[PDB]
Amino acid sequence: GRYYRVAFYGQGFFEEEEGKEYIYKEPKYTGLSEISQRLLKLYADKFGADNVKIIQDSNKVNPKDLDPKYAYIQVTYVTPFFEEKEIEDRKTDFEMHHNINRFVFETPFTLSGKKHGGVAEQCKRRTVLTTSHLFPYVKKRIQVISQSSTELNPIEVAIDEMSRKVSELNQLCTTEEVDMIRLQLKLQGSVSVKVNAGPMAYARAFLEETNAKKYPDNQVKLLKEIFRQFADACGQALDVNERLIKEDQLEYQEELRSHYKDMLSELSAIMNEQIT
Amino acid sequence: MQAIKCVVVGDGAVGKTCLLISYTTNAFPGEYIPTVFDNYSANVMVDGKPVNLGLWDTAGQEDYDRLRPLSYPQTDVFLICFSLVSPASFENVRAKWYPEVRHHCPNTPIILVGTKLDLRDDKDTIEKLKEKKLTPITYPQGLAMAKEIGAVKYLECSALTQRGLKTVFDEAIRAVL
Numbered sequence: 421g422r423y424y425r426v427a428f429y430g431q432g433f434f435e436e437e438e439g440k441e442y443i444y445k446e447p448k449y450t451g452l453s454e455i456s457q458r459l460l461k462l463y464a465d466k467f468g469a470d471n472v473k474i475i476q477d478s479n480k481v482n483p484k485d486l487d488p489k490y491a492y493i494q495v496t497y498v499t500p501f502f503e504e505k506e507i508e509d510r511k512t513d514f515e516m517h518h519n520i521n522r523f524v525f526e527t528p529f530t531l532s533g534k535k536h537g538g539v540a541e542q543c544k545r546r547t548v549l550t551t552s553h554l555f556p557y558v559k560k561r562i563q564v565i566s567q568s569s570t571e572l573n574p575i576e577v578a579i580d581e582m583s584r585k586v587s588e589l590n591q592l593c594t595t596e597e598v599d600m601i602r603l604q605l606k607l608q609g610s611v612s613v614k615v616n617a618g619p620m621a622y623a624r625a626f627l628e629e630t631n632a633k634k635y636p637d638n639q640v641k642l643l644k645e646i647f648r649q650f651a652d653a654c655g656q657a658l659d660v661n662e663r664l665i666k667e668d669q670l671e672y673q674e675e676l677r678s679h680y681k682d683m684l685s686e687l688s689a690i691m692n693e694q695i696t
Numbered sequence: 697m698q699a700i701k702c703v704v705v706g707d708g709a710v711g712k713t714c715l716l717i718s719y720t721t722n723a724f725p726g727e728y729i730p731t732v733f734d735n736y737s738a739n740v741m742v743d744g745k746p747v748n749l750g751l752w753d754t755a756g757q758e759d760y761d762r763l764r765p766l767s768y769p770q771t772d773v774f775l776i777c778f779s780l781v782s783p784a785s786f787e788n789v790r791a792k793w794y795p796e797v798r799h800h801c802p803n804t805p806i807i808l809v810g811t812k813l814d815l816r817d818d819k820d821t822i823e824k825l826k827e828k829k830l831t832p833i834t835y836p837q838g839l840a841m842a843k844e845i846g847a848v849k850y851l852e853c854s855a856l857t858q859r860g861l862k863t864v865f866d867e868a869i870r871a872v873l
Contacts, residue, residue, distance in 0.1 A: 422722075449741040452722045453858035476724035497722040526729055535726070542730050581732065601699040601770065602737065605750040608767070609735035614755040615713055617732040672766040 422450040423498050423523055425549060426459065426561070429475070429483055430491030433467045442561040443498065443523050443551050456495050467491050478527045479545075480567075498523035501548050521551045521562075529571075539617055540625040544572045544580075575635045575643060578622040582646045585610060585619070589653035593660050600664040607657045610650075612679040620683060623647060623690050644691060651687060651695050654680055698745070701770050702868050703752040705793050706777030707785040711811040711855060715777075716751050718855045719865055725855040742869045749869060761796075768800045772872045773807065775864070776845075780810040780833045780852060781821050786841065794845040805871040808847040809864055810838045814854040 427441040428434045446455055456474055464472045475481060475494035486492055500516065501524035510516050527545040530537040547569045551562040572580060589610065592603045610619065626635065626643055658673075658680055665673050688695045704712050718725045720736040736751040752767050754760070776793045778785040789808065797806060815821040816832040825831055835852065842850035849867045853860030 449739075451719075451862050452724070453862055456858065476726055478723075478727045496727070528727065528729055536728075536730060539730075539732065544729060585733065599699050599748070601701050601750050602748060604770075605701075605735045605737060605752065606733075608752075609733045613732065613734045614760055615734050615753050616730075619732050621732050668769040672769060675763060675766050 421448055422446040422455075423500065424452075424455050425494070425496040425498050425523070425525065425564070426455075427475075427481065427494040428492070429481055429486055429494070430467075431483075432488060433463075433471070433491035441549070441564040443549065443555075443564060444561045445555055445557075452495070452497055456493075459493050459495065463491060463493060478525060478547075479529070496525050498525045498549065500524075518556065519554045521554045522548055523551075524548045538625075539578060539621045540574050542574055542577055544577050546570050546572070575626050575639050578626055579639065579643050579646060582619065582622060582643065582650055586646060586649045586653050589650075589657050593653070593656045598660060598664060600661070603657060603661055603664070607654070607661055608676060611654050611658070611676055611683055619647075619650065620686055620690075623687055627690050629692075647687060647691070648695065651684055654683075655696055697739070697748050698873075699748045699750060700772045700869060700872050701750050701752065702773050702775060702865075703754065703767060703771045704775045704777060705754050705764075705797065706756055706775075706809075707779075707782070707788050707792075708756045710756075710777050710779040710782060710785050712756075712777050713753055715811060715853065715855045715861065715864075716753055718858075719861055720751065724858075738865070740865065740869060742866055742873065745873065747869055747873075749865060765796070765800045768797075771801060771804055773805045773868050774801070775807050775809050775868060776847070777809045777811055778833070779812045779815075780838070781812050781815045781818075781825065783830050783833065786833050786837075789841055789845065806845065806847045807849045807851060807864070807868055807871060808838065808842040808845065810850075810852040812854065813852045813859060814856045 424444045424446060425441065426444050428437040430438065444455065460472055460474060472491045475492050478496040481494055500520045501522040502516065525547055527547065528535055529543050529545060530541045531543065536542060547567055549564045550566045552565045553562050588606060592598060592606060626640065658677060661673060684695050704716065706712055714725050716736045717728045720738045734753050736753065738749050740747050740749050754764055754767060774797050776789055776797065778789050810833060838852065839850050848871050851860060851864050851867060853864050855861065
């Protein structure tokens with residue numbers, strides 16, 4: 421199923437549910453608008469439609485921010501959380517869908533107080549919620565009874581996002597029957613970024629020697645090694661795409677290669693190494 | 697699982713990336729986790745069929761006009777987006793985006809998407825448009841444009857309220873399936 425955190429705040433409105441937080445288990449493929457609208461209509465029928473509001477902020481609510489004229493419902497998508505010790509003991513998919521009581525979501529923040537920033541400022545919080553009972557369960561929701569959180573600073577965000585991209589690209593290249601459209605989406609989204617900042621934004625912010633030093637040497641060294649792996653993964657993905665394409669995508673492929681070569685040229689200049 | 701390529705075009709600053717991130721991460725737009733990478737994907741269930749929807753996020757500005765059509769081969773469906781509170785982006789549906797898509801892809805279904813639905817009634821937004829003697833795009837006007845360009849659907853959505861968001865991508869898939 422699809423799991424959501426739902427938390428109720430409404431001193432003049434809620435009774436048993438006041439100040440409580442639950443994980444709701446929804447049918448597979450349930451989207452955020454579907455559960456949010458159902459919850460909104462359900463409690464609007466109890467309290468009045470002008471009197472119920474959704475809290476979209478995923479940070480822990482401070483009730484001092486809330487207007488006592490309204491009942492509030494905080495809704496946030498979560499996914500089942502497993503530590504690396506759990507992810508190995510659980511062979512089948514029936515085992516990562518069975519006996520689960522921990523759920524994770526991520527919140528963006530920066531240390532200035534702004535919620536978002538560029539790659540040198542953007543931090544991320546990972547919050548794990550633990551329910552009082554295990555799913556699967558007789559009820560559709562289970563109360564959250566504890567939370568834990570960790571936070572990633574900007575270079576840790578870069579290390580996390582770049583490491584995950586390397587694994588994702590390598591996975592696509594080793595799949596027995598590569599889905600060309602899925603490969604191209606991720607490949608083009610790595611070597612030919614035009615809308616978002618591009619992976620070289622991390623290299624400029626954290627690896628360039630003309631920036632003032634800010635992070636431990638060992639973390640800079642780790643990010644450098646991940647970028648070496650990213651360069652390699654992009655090249656391998658480009659070679660797989662070369663075999664898959666038909667004539668209609670020759671010009672597209674050659675443009676991806678040109679962008680890839682330009683990216684390696686810039687990375688080489690930043691790292692003072694001849695990269696591929 | 698059937699893989700579907702959907703290419704999203706339209707002027708910059710109509711909210712395209714925000715919508716794509718919000719839909720594919722199942723999160724409200726204010727809570728998005730910035731990514732440095734482009735394009736998005738989702739596993740979707742439409743009329744009992746599971747599909748992987750690949751969403752190409754294209755740069756709309758003129759500097760990218762020359763290379764943007766290289767993303768069009770193998771496309772199954774186009775979303776042409778404009779902001780309901782940007783008359784300029786609406787006019788470019790007719791002056792730029794519809795002609796560009798059809799020059800390259802004569803037979804691919806087009807869905808016309810009006811974004812920022814929540815701002816059409818926003819008092820603040822309404823007043824600032826009045827400063828330049830402008831007014832939001834109404835639903836009849838959007839529908840009239842969809843008729844003009846031969847779009848198979850006309851849909852309005854809001855990333856902020858999530859209204860109409862699920863329907864955009866369900867209908868993108870139904871235009872292919």
